[PDB]
Amino acid sequence: QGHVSIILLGATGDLAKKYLWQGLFQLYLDEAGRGHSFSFHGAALTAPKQGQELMAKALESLSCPKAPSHCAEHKDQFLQLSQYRQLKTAEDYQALNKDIEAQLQHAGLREAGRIFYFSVPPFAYEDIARNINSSCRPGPGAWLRVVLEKPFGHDHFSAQQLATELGTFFQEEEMYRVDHYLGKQAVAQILPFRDQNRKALDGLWNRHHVERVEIIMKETVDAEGRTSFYEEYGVIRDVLQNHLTEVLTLVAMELPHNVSSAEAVLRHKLQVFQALRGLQRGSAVVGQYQSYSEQVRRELQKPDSFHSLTPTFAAVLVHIDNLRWEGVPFILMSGKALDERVGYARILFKNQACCVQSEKHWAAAQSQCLPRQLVFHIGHGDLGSPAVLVSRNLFRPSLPSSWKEMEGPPGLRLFGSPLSDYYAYSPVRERDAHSVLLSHIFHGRKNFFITTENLLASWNFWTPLLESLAHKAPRLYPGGAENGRLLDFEFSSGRLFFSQQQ
Amino acid sequence: GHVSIILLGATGDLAKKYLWQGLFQLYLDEAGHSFSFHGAALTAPKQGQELMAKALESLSCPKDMAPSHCAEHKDQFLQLSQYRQLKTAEDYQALNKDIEAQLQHAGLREAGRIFYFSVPPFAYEDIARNINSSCRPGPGAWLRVVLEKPFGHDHFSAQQLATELGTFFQEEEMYRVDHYLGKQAVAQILPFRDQNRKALDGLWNRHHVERVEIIMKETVDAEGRTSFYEEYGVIRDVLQNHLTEVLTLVAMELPHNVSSAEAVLRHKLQVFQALRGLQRGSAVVGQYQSYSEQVRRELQKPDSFHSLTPTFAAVLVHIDNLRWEGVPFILMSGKALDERVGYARILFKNQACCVQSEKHWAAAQSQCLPRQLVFHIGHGDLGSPAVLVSRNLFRPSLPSSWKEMEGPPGLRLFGSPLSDYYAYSPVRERDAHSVLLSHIFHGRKNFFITTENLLASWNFWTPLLESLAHKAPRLYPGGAENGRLLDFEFSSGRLFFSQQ
């Protein structure tokens, strides 16, 4: 019960038009008619009338989920509630304050909060936040949940500097650092999956029961339309640091007695960040596709001849010095312009049985000589949808009513094994990442977000690898299906090396 | 070089089941060096004479060579074969005189004498000294004595029998044979490790081997053999003597050369002294449902008797070296099971991650496919001896006696198409007993059980025999019905049944 105001401070960019406006809408569509009033203040540096026209075009670009009365009433209310305003000068911020209290007077209720989504380019951060602190603070006990974007820095030093410079203005409890990959429906089912299936998996998470762990994100689309974001950032900081490390610290984490608790999850994942081996020179292998250097050459004009050392595919080996993962290797690899686009967290058990019966009667749900594995399929690939795949000989898993037993094509091969072998589950309704992330911002659930202790622990993990890998020339690959086995690699002891030397 | 071979078990069925055929094959391989062949039994001499004539009637031959030469070679072997009845020491003196008479008939020279024992063990003593007192050969000749596969039931009986027979004959002049040491791929593990010196020296580690399996599965239950089987058991008849020997063959550190034929004998004991002890949790034990009724029927036993004799046994072996400290070695054998297979499988752990798709994985280049090195020896889906090397590992190098195998497609060995393997096969199918008799005539001693290694292998299973002296076996229905009843797992250093 209370009016909640959501303001999108960023300039209307590409992803601002693509994902976020549909996200806020969907956010309005879930919680409408529950005593919560709303105000969707479009904010940018553009003209007010032109901003109103562009933002109304954005409101007309939205699509309701698959009744015409539902679409008509909710699109009319969404056109009524949302309003653009100019954000060029400092006194326009208290003009926004006047607008917010005016819309509170129209709502006739008590203020509940003020969400300030940031999407601005990183040329300036202190002026907008200091104007928010000057005027745009809320009233009687309303919270102020601001959200920052993905680029946080290039080392631990810049990340710490920006964390203190932005935590001067706002509390760290108020802030919501968004992770895209934590909103994916299979990543968000890892800890609940371990929660209602701890009776038959906690006896198997050990070092003496797990062969290997692979956290995989393959992509076919290269750096098209996104080159200038990529030459400074690199694939280690792009996906491994902010997506793969968080699912890595989600699988290898001691579960608390209440996963629904907030702070226990972050303290246990900090425990995982403290109980892991450091990274060396030889624990990582990198590559870049041949079109990347000439793409950077043709996108930015620099004198003489230039060759970029930016990694585009990377594989790292991670060991966790514990009583749980002492000998288990953890492979995190990702790259673009590969031969496939897929994403999965796959834990592979070790072979420990000899079967008296031959392969003529090796049933999928009975014998223990067929491989045992758990796959969290995030999406794409041959399956497309997100999935939870259990080997049938392990156990019968329990998943909530949001997921159901799916029936894919029989005989489809995943890691050399037929699909029929897996107990496969898929969600009963697909949801975007940003929609559930904005719903969690509105609900104030900080379990799916990043605190600065976790961010600096991640940067202290990853920075020695980055400064060691800052002078190695990567191995070129043609990309697509023409790669063959040029990027394949082995792990020997705590070191990674390519299969086919050159 | 006239050699006098005497078979002392002519009344037995195994004499003309394998031994007469092996002696005929030895003549066919070695026909000029003179030969003489004599037989002996505790049988009436006319009945013994018609019996060895009947044994000489049933003689097979290779099909490649012409039957016209086969007929005259068979007539020559019929000429050289003789029989003699033995009761008292004067009869063995007459045997020595008849041996000298055969020297004066053809080839007046004693190259040596060979004695083959096939009698039941309780008469092994006195006949032996009947050889020792009078039937010794000449000055420059040698004497060879061959004994059968039983060597007692523990280290106590093996030590007693070895010390009883060590008085008459020396270690240098005594030969011991087991049944499955004559297999050609069993005789090919050390030549394979010898030839692949540059390729396989960096892979015989703890760093690359996941597990080692040695299986000898059977589908035939002992029907009339169960009187012999009841006091012996599956551990003593195959696991103690054949599977242990192959294990030592694959686990021993290879010498400077195998042709020296002496460092092979001493490098085998280093596997024995480094083998850790066997506990009662290292073995699983089963029997089929009809074995109790089988011992109840032929042997005079009460109707409430339930034997505890094992027919199926799986044991776990750990060695403790700088090579294979944590690698498990699973030895399995059984009766009335599904597939009559015999092989020795080496499995390597999964080491690679492959970027390219599973639909584009070459059998000869992608390391994500399983790597294996299999010595198949008997009666599988192949039906022939084979040395299977997966193509992603390395290109194997076998000698001229082994050819590359043309395998039919649609064949699944260890979950993989035969194509995946670089399989090989011998040119000539030679039996085990024939090449063992050829080695007995040759005197190479690397293919025979010595006195030290026999006792070294008996005290390793005697605590397991005493530990499982009262454990009830698992009663499986037998045949193909035992799907998952006999499946087992190894947890650390323990074995347990999957089903309760």
Ligand SMILES: *[C@@H]1O[C@H](CO)[C@@H](O)[C@H](O)[C@H]1NC(C)=O
């Ligand atoms: C808001 O930010 C300004 C920036 O200088 C700071 O002075 C002020 O203390 C902040 N207000 C808080 C933390 O309540």
